[PDB]
PDB file of C-alpha atoms in Angstrom:
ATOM      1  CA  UNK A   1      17.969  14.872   0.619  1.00  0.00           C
ATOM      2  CA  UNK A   2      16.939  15.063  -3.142  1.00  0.00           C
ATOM      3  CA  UNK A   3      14.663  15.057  -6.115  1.00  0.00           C
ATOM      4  CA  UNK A   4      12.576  12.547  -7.789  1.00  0.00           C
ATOM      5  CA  UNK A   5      14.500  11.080 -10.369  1.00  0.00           C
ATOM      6  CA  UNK A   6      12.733   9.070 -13.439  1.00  0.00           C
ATOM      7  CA  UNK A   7      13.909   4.969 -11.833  1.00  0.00           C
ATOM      8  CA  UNK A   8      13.691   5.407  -7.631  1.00  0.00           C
ATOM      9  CA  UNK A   9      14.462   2.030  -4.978  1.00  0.00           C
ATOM     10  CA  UNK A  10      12.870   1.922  -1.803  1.00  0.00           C
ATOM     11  CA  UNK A  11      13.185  -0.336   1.397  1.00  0.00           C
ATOM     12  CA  UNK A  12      10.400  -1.176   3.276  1.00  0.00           C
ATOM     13  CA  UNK A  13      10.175  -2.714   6.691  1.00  0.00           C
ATOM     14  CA  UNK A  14       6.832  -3.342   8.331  1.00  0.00           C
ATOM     15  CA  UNK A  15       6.169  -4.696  12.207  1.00  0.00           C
ATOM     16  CA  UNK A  16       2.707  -5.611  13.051  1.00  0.00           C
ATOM     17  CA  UNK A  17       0.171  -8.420  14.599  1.00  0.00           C
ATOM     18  CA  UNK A  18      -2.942  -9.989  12.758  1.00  0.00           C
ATOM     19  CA  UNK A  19      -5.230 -11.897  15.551  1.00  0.00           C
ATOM     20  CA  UNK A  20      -2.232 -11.788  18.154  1.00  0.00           C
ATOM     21  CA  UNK A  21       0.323 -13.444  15.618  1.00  0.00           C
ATOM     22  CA  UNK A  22       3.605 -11.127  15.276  1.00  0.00           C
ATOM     23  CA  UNK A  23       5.569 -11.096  12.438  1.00  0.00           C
ATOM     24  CA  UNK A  24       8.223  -8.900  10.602  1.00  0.00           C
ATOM     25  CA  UNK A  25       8.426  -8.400   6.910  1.00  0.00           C
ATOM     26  CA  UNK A  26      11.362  -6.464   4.818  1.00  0.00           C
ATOM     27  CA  UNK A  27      11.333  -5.490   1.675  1.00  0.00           C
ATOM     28  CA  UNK A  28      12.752  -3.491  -1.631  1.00  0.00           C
ATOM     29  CA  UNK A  29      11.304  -2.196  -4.660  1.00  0.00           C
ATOM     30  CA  UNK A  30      12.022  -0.289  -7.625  1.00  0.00           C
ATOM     31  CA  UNK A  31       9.885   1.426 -10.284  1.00  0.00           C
ATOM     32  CA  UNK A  32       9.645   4.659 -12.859  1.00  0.00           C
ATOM     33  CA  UNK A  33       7.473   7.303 -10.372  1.00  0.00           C
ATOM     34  CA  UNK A  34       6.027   9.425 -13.450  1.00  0.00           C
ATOM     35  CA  UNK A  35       4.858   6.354 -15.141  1.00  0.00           C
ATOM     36  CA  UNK A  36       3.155   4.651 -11.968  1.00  0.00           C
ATOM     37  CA  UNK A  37       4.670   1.619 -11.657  1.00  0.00           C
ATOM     38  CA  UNK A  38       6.536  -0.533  -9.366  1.00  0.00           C
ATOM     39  CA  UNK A  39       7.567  -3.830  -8.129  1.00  0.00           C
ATOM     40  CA  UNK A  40       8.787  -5.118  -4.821  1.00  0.00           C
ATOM     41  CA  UNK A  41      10.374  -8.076  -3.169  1.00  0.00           C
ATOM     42  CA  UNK A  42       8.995  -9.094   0.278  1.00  0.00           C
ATOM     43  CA  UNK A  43      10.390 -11.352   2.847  1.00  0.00           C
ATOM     44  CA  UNK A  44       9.137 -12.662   6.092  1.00  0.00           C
ATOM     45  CA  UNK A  45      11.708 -12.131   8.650  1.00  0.00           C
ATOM     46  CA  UNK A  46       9.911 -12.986  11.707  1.00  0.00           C
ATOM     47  CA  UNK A  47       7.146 -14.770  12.646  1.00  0.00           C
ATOM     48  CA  UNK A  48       6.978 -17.039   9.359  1.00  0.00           C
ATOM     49  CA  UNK A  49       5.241 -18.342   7.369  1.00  0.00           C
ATOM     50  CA  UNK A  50       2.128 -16.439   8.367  1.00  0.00           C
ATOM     51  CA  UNK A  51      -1.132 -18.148   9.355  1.00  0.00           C
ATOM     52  CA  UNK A  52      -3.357 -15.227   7.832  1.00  0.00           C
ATOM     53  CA  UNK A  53      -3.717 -14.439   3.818  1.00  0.00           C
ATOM     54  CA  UNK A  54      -0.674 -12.371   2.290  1.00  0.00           C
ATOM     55  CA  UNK A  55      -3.729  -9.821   0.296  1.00  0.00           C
ATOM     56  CA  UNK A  56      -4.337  -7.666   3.400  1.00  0.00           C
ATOM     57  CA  UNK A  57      -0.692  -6.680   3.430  1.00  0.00           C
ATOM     58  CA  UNK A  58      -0.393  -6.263  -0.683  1.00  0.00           C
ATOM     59  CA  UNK A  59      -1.765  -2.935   0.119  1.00  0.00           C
ATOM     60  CA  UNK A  60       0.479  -1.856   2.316  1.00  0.00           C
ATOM     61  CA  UNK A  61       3.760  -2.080   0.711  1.00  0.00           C
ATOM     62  CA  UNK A  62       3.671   3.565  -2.153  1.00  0.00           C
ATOM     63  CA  UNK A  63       1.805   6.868  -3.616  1.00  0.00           C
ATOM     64  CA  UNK A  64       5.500   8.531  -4.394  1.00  0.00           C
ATOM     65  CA  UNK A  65       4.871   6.046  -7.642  1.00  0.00           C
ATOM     66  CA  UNK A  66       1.054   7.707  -8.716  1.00  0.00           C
ATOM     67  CA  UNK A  67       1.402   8.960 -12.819  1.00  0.00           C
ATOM     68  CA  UNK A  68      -0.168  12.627 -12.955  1.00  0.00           C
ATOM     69  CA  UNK A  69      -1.745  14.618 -15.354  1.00  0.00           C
ATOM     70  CA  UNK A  70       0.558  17.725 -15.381  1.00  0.00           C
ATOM     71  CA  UNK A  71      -2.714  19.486 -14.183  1.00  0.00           C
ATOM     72  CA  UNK A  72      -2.940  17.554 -10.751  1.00  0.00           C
ATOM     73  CA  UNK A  73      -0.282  18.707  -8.670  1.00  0.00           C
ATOM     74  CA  UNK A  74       1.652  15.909  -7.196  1.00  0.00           C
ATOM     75  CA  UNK A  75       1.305  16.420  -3.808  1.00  0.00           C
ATOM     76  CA  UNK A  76       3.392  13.335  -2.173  1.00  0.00           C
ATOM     77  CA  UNK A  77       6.310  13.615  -4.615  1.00  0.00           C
ATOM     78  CA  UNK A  78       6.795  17.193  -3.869  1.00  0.00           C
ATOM     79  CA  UNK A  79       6.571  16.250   0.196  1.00  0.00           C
ATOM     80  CA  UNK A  80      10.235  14.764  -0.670  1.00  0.00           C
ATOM     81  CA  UNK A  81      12.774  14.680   0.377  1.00  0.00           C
ATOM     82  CA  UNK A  82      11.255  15.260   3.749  1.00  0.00           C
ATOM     83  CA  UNK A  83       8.524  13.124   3.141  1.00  0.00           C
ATOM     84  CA  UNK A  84       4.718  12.034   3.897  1.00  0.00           C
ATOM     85  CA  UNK A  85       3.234  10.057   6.837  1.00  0.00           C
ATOM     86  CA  UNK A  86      -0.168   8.208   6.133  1.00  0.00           C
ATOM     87  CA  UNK A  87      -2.903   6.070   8.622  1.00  0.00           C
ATOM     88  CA  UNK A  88      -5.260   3.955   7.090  1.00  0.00           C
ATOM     89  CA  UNK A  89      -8.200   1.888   8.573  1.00  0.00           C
ATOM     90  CA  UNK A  90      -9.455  -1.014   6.564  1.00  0.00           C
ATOM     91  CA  UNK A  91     -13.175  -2.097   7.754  1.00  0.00           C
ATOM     92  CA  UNK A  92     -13.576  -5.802   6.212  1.00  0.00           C
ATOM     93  CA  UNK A  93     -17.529  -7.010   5.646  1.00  0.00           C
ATOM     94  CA  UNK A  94     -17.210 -10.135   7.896  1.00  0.00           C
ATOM     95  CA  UNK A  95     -16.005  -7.420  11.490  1.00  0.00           C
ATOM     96  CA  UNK A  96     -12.049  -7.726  11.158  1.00  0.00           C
ATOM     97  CA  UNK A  97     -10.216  -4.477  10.853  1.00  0.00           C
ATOM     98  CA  UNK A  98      -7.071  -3.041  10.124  1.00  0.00           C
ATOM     99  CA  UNK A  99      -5.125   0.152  11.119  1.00  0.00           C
ATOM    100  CA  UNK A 100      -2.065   0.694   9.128  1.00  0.00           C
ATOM    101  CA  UNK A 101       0.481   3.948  10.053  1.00  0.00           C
ATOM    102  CA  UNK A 102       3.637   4.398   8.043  1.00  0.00           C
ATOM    103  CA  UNK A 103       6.192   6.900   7.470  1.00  0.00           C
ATOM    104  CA  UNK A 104       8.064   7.620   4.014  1.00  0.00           C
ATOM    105  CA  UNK A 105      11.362   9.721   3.485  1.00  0.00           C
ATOM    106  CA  UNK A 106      14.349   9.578   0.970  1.00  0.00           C
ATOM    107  CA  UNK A 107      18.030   8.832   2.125  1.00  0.00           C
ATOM    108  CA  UNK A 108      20.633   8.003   0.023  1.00  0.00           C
ATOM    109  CA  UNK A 109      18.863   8.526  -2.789  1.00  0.00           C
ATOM    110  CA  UNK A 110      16.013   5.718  -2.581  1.00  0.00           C
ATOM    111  CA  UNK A 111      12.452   5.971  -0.561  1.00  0.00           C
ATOM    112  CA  UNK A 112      12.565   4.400   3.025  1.00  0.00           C
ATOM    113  CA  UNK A 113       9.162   2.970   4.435  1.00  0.00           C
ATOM    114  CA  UNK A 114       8.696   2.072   7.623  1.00  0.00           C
ATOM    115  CA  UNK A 115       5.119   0.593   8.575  1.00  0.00           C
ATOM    116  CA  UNK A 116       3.553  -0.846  11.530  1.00  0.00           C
ATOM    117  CA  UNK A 117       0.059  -2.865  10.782  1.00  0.00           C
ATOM    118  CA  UNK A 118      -2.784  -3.832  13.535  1.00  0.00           C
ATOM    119  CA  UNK A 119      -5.202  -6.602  12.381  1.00  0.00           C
ATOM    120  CA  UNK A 120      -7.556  -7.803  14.487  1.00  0.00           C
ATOM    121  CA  UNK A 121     -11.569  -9.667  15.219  1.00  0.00           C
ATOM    122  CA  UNK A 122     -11.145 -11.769  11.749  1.00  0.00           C
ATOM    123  CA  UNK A 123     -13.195 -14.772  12.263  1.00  0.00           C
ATOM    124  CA  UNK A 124     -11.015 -17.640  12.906  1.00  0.00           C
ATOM    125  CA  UNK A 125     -13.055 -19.673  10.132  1.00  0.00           C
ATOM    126  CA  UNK A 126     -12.956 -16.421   7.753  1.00  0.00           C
ATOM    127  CA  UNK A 127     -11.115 -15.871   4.375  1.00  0.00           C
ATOM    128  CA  UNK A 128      -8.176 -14.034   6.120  1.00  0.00           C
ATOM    129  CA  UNK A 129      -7.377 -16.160   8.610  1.00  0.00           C
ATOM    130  CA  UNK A 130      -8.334 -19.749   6.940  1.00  0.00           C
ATOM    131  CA  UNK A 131      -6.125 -18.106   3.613  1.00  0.00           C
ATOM    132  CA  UNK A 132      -8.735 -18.249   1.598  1.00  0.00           C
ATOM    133  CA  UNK A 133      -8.486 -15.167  -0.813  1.00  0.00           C
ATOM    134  CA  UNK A 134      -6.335 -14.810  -4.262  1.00  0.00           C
ATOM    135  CA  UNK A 135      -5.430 -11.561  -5.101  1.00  0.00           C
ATOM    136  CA  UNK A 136      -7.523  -8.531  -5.066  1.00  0.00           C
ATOM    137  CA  UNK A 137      -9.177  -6.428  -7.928  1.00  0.00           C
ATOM    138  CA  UNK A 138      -8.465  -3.549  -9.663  1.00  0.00           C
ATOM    139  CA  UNK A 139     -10.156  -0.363  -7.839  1.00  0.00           C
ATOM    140  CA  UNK A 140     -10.486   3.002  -7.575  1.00  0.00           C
ATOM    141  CA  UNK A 141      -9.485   5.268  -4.957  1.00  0.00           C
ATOM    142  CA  UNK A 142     -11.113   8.402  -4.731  1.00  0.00           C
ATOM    143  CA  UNK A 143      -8.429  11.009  -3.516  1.00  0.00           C
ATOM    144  CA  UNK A 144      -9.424  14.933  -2.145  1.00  0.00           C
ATOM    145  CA  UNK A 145      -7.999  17.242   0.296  1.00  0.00           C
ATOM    146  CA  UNK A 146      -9.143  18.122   3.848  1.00  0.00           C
ATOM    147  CA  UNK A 147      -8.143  19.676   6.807  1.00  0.00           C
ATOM    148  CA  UNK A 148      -4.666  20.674   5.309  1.00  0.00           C
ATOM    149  CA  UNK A 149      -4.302  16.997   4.254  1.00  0.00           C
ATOM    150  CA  UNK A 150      -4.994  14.489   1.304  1.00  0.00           C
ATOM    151  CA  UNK A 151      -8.034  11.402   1.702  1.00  0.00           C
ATOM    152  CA  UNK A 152      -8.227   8.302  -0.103  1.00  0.00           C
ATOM    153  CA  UNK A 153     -11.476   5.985   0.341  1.00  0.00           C
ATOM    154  CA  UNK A 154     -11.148   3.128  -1.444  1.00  0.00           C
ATOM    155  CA  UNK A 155     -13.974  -0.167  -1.961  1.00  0.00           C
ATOM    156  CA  UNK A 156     -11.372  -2.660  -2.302  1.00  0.00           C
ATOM    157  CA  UNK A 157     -12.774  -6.128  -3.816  1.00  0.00           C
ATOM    158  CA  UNK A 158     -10.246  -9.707  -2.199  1.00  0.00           C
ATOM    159  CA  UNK A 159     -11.006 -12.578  -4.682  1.00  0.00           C
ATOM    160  CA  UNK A 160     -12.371 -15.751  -3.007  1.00  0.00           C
ATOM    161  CA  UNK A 161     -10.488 -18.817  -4.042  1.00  0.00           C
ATOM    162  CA  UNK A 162     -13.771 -20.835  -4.097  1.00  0.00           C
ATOM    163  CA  UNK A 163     -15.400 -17.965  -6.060  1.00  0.00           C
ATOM    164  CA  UNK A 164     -17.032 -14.472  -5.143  1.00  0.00           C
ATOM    165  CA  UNK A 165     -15.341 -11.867  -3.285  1.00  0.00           C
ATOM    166  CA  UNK A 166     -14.633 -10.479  -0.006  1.00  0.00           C
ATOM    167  CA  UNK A 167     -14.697  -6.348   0.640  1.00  0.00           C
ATOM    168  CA  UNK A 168     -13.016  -4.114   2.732  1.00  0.00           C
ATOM    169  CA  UNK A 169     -14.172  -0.236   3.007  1.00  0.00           C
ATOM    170  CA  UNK A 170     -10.547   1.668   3.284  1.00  0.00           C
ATOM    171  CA  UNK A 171      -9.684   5.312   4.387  1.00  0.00           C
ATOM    172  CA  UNK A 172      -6.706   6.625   4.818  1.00  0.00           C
ATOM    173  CA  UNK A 173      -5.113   9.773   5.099  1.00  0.00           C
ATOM    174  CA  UNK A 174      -1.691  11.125   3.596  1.00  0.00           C
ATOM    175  CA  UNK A 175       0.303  14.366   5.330  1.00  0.00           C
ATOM    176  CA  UNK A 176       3.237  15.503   4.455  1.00  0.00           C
ATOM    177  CA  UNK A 177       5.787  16.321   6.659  1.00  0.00           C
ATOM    178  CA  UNK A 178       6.164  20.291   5.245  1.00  0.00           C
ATOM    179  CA  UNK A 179       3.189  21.824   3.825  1.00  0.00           C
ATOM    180  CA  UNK A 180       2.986  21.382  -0.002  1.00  0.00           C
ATOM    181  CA  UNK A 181       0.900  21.889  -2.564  1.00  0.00           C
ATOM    182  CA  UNK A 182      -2.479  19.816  -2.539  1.00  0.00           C
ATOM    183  CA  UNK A 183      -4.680  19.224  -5.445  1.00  0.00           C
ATOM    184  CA  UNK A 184      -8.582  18.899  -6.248  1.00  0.00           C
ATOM    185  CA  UNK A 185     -10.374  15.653  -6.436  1.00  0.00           C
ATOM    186  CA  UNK A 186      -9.523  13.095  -8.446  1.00  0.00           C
ATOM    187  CA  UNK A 187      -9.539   9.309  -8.818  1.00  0.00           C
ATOM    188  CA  UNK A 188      -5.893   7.014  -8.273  1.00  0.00           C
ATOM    189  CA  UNK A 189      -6.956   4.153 -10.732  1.00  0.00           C
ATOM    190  CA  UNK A 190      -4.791   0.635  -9.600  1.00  0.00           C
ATOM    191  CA  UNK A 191      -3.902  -2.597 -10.500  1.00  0.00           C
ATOM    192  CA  UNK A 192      -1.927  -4.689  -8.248  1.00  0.00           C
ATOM    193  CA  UNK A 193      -0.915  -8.350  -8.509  1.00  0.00           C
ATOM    194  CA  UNK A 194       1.231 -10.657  -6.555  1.00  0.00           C
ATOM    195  CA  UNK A 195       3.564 -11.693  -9.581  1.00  0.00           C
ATOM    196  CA  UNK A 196       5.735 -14.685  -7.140  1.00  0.00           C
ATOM    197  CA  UNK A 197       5.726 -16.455  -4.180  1.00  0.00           C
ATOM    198  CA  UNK A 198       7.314 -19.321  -2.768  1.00  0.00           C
ATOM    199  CA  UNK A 199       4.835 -22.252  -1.621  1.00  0.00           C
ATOM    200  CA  UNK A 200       4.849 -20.750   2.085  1.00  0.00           C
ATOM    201  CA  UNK A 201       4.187 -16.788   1.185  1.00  0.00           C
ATOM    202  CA  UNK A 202       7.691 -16.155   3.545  1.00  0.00           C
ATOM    203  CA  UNK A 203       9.003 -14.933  -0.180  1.00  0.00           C
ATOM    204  CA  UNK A 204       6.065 -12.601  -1.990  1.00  0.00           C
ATOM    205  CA  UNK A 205       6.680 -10.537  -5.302  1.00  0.00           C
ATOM    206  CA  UNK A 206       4.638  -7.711  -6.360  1.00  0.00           C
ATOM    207  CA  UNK A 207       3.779  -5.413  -8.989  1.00  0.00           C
ATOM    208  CA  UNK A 208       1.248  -2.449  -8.980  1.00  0.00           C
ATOM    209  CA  UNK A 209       0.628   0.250 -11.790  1.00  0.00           C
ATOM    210  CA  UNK A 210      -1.384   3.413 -10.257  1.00  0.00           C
ATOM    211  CA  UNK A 211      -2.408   6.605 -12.799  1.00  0.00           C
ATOM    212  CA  UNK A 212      -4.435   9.643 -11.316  1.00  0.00           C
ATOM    213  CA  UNK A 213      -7.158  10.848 -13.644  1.00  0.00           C
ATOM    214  CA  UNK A 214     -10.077  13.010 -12.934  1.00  0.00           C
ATOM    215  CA  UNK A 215     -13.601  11.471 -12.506  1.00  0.00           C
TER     216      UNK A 215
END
């Protein structure tokens, strides 16, 4: 129950199942929200270490941290301290697929994010689940409103260790909880890089700078 101050924390907790295999992850982060950028720590707490590539979770672990133009109303920091929802569907190139659903709010004065993550149909010989990708590139996500409702379609680009690259068509939606102010179109331009990790990926660090800007 507050306002978005210039340095914000969040905890993040996510539950989910790539292939079948279950696992837990926790987390915390910190970042400046008007200057779009954060970092987080990650740690497997179940289901470790995980026998799928850490890059299809990078993604899922925070639009409260987006730097706008004072002309693009900021539609998920005003959501607080209520907060958002959002669902995403990632369609990878080789069949696998992920759904993503997570819920954001603010209590005691730092973001909480809970997530839940389906994976599923990755070949068993594919990049995912042989580990084969390292990192992802910087994209694009084109962001507009609909049906009451913000969109985000993103062509997101995994590296492939062995060179090339591996692509995923995302779309997700973002709701938040009260109606609020929605903009026009624009573009979320983002970088995001795994800064640590421990040989096993049970202990991940990232960082990920995001600025809206109109096409």
């Amino acid at each position: 129950m507050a306002i978005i101050k210039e340095f914000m924390r969040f905890k993040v907790h996510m539950e989910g199942s790539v292939n079948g295999h279950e696992f837990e992850i926790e987390g915390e982060g910190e970042g400046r929200p008007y200057e779009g950028t954060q970092t987080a720590k990650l740690k497997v707490t179940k289901g470790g270490p995980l026998p799928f590539a850490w890059d299809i979770l990078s993604y899922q672990f925070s639009k409260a941290y987006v730097k706008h133009p004072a002309d693009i109303p900021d539609y998920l920091k005003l959501s607080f301290p209520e907060g958002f929802k959002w669902e995403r569907v990632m369609n990878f190139e080789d069949g696998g697929v992920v759904t993503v659903t997570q819920d954001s709010s603010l209590q005691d004065g730092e973001f909480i994010y809970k997530v839940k993550l389906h994976g599923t149909n990755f070949p068993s010989d594919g990049p995912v689940m042989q580990k084969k990708t390292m990192g992802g590139e910087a994209s694009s996500e084109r962001m507009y409103p609909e049906d009451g409702a913000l969109k985000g379609e993103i062509k997101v680009r995994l590296k492939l260790k062995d060179g090339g690259h591996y692509d995923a068509e995302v779309k997700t939606t973002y709701k938040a909880k009260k109606p609020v102010q929605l903009p026009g179109a624009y573009n979320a331009n983002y970088k995001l890089d795994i800064t640590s990790h421990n040989e096993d990926y049970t202990i991940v660090e990232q960082y990920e700078r995001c600025e809206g800007r109109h096409s």
